[PDB]
Enzyme design. Sequence first.
Site, short mmCIF file in Angstrom:
data_model
loop_
_atom_site.label_atom_id
_atom_site.label_comp_id
_atom_site.label_asym_id
_atom_site.label_seq_id
_atom_site.Cartn_x
_atom_site.Cartn_y
_atom_site.Cartn_z
N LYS A 115 0.83 -1.21 0.00
CA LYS A 115 0.00 0.00 0.00
C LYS A 115 0.86 1.25 0.00
CE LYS A 115 -2.74 -0.31 3.63
NZ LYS A 115 -2.47 -1.67 4.17
N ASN A 138 -2.55 6.47 6.83
CA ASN A 138 -2.01 5.30 7.51
C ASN A 138 -0.51 5.13 7.22
OD1 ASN A 138 -2.75 2.93 9.19
ND2 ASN A 138 -2.13 1.74 7.39
N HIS A 183 -5.50 -8.69 10.47
CA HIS A 183 -6.21 -8.02 11.56
C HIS A 183 -7.61 -8.63 11.73
CE1 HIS A 183 -3.23 -4.96 12.32
NE2 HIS A 183 -3.22 -4.58 11.05
C1 LIG Z 1 -3.42 0.79 14.75
C2 LIG Z 1 -3.43 1.88 13.68
O1 LIG Z 1 -4.46 2.04 12.96
N1 LIG Z 1 -2.31 2.62 13.56
C3 LIG Z 1 -2.31 3.81 12.72
C4 LIG Z 1 -2.66 5.06 13.56
O2 LIG Z 1 -1.61 5.23 14.54
P1 LIG Z 1 -2.04 5.70 16.00
O3 LIG Z 1 -0.82 5.80 16.81
O4 LIG Z 1 -2.90 6.94 15.82
O5 LIG Z 1 -2.92 4.46 16.44
P2 LIG Z 1 -4.00 4.28 17.63
O6 LIG Z 1 -5.37 4.36 17.05
O7 LIG Z 1 -3.66 5.25 18.68
O8 LIG Z 1 -3.74 2.80 18.06
C5 LIG Z 1 -2.38 2.35 18.40
C6 LIG Z 1 -2.40 1.12 19.34
O9 LIG Z 1 -3.01 1.39 20.64
C7 LIG Z 1 -4.17 0.62 20.79
N2 LIG Z 1 -5.29 1.30 21.41
C8 LIG Z 1 -5.82 2.51 20.89
C9 LIG Z 1 -6.77 3.21 21.56
C10 LIG Z 1 -7.24 2.72 22.85
O10 LIG Z 1 -8.09 3.25 23.52
N3 LIG Z 1 -6.69 1.53 23.32
C11 LIG Z 1 -5.72 0.77 22.68
O11 LIG Z 1 -5.29 -0.29 23.18
C12 LIG Z 1 -4.52 0.04 19.41
O12 LIG Z 1 -5.17 -1.28 19.66
C13 LIG Z 1 -3.17 -0.09 18.82
O13 LIG Z 1 -2.51 -1.21 19.39
O14 LIG Z 1 -2.69 6.25 12.72
C14 LIG Z 1 -1.43 6.52 12.01
C15 LIG Z 1 -1.64 7.78 11.17
O15 LIG Z 1 -2.79 7.59 10.32
C16 LIG Z 1 -1.04 5.32 11.16
O16 LIG Z 1 0.20 5.57 10.52
C17 LIG Z 1 -0.93 4.07 12.06
O17 LIG Z 1 -0.56 2.96 11.28
C18 LIG Z 1 0.34 1.90 11.68
C19 LIG Z 1 1.63 1.99 10.88
C20 LIG Z 1 -0.38 0.57 11.67
O18 LIG Z 1 0.10 -0.42 12.21
N4 LIG Z 1 -1.56 0.57 11.02
C21 LIG Z 1 -2.22 -0.65 10.56
C22 LIG Z 1 -3.71 -0.41 10.33
C23 LIG Z 1 -1.55 -1.24 9.28
O19 LIG Z 1 -1.05 -0.46 8.41
O20 LIG Z 1 -1.51 -2.48 9.16
#
Ligand SMILES: CC(=O)N[C@H]1[C@@H](OP(=O)(O)OP(=O)(O)OC[C@H]2O[C@@H](n3ccc(=O)[nH]c3=O)[C@H](O)[C@@H]2O)O[C@H](CO)[C@@H](O)[C@@H]1O[C@H](C)C(=O)N[C@@H](C)C(=O)O
Length: 431
Positions: A115, A138, A183
């Site tokens: 991606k 992302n 996922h």
């Molecule tokens: C999990 C996810 O969707 N990550 C994307 C997200 O990062 P961000 O740090 O904002 O993530 P988050 O929503 O705070 O979640 C991070 C982690 O904390 C956890 N989490 C979050 C909120 C909460 O109340 N409790 C909890 O346990 C999530 O389960 C996860 O383990 O927003 C960023 C900016 O858009 C992305 O770059 C980032 O992608 C990473 C690289 C990723 O792993 N994404 C997945 C979807 C992928 O590409 O496979």
Amino acid sequence: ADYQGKNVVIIGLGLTGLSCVDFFLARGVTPRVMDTRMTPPGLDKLPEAVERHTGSLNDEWLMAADLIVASPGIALAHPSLSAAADAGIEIVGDIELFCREAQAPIVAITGSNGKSTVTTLVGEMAKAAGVNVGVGGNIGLPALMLLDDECELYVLELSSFQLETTSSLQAVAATILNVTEDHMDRYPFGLQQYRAAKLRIYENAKVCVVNADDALTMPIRGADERCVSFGVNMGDYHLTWLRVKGEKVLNVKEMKLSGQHNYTNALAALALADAAGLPRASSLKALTTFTGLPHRFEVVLEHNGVRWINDSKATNVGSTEAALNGLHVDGTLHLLLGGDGKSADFSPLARYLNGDNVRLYCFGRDGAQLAALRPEVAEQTETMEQAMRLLAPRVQPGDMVLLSPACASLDQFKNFEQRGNEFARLAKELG
Ligand SMILES: CC(=O)N[C@H]1[C@@H](OP(=O)(O)OP(=O)(O)OC[C@H]2O[C@@H](n3ccc(=O)[nH]c3=O)[C@H](O)[C@@H]2O)O[C@H](CO)[C@@H](O)[C@@H]1O[C@H](C)C(=O)N[C@@H](C)C(=O)O
């Protein structure tokens, strides 16, 4: 959209959550925030005025909200969120907020693996045509940190998670590169539930770029007049020569990458850039120079136990914040900040500069304001060179010298690439 006077609650204090917090604060709205994690990365980045609850969700806060902004990391199926939804409380994610504000066309990309590569290439094709492009989502830089009335095109990599909470996306071109289960803990009801999340990317898209070799990437109800496809031997864009709409357009010998995968990446990318209205001339040029996903940072020197890191491409506050997130520094961080920035967005950055192991060296047009973020550990010079000669005798084994300016370089350089080369040269002479 109007958020004035609304009770806003943000779930998730990671990169996305923080961007949302800043988005709201910059509009005079103080949200409440929560995260099930006890110490999320953005916990110490919040202004004291923001009420926060960590270690679990606060259901009273959610049920009392006018708007819930859910980070991609928490599922809409979570009982707390399900409850809020049944009670009719609007739930959105950062991408939704972004789409409501965007003033430039959006190319949207999703799928599984690769991606980022296709997203990056489309970005390059836009850069080749001279389009002020903003690449994010992302892929790394939260979409909301890209908002700028100067941006002429946005290229977003989107996850199924972000897609589930987005409803106002109207991409000029969108694609699901492929549907391969991942996922699955977030999609307990099966491939159809998983597929449904990705398919949301085609809702109101002007053109849907589909994978001829993966039938699941076709929107439900078969392919329509909006769909253009890419594939290995079949499809509008296929394969050696790259075939497009029946006509050869490029001999794969002209591009640096090889292999099937790198070719279908180039084809999917071209189909998107053509749909977005980018000249095929420049897009093809980009295809012939593209050497893949760049490294997050360029290490220009590692000597005497000190790493000199070039991130001159961080031309805005959101990028610098992203560079600092989870940054491993064994000793003191000598951060270089400066150039022509967006003063209106500086204030939140101060919250990332606390601690006993950080030194700021501020230069350029807005050096004074930047240094003012935390005066006690900042030095201010006119140019970057002066700033570096200043820090040079001060570094010790374990420290990191990081150029992640948070500003454009136009006030003293021809472009951030030149600013980075300058930094490379100076680091070699000084480190
Ligand atoms: C999990 C996810 O969707 N990550 C994307 C997200 O990062 P961000 O740090 O904002 O993530 P988050 O929503 O705070 O979640 C991070 C982690 O904390 C956890 N989490 C979050 C909120 C909460 O109340 N409790 C909890 O346990 C999530 O389960 C996860 O383990 O927003 C960023 C900016 O858009 C992305 O770059 C980032 O992608 C990473 C690289 C990723 O792993 N994404 C997945 C979807 C992928 O590409 O496979």
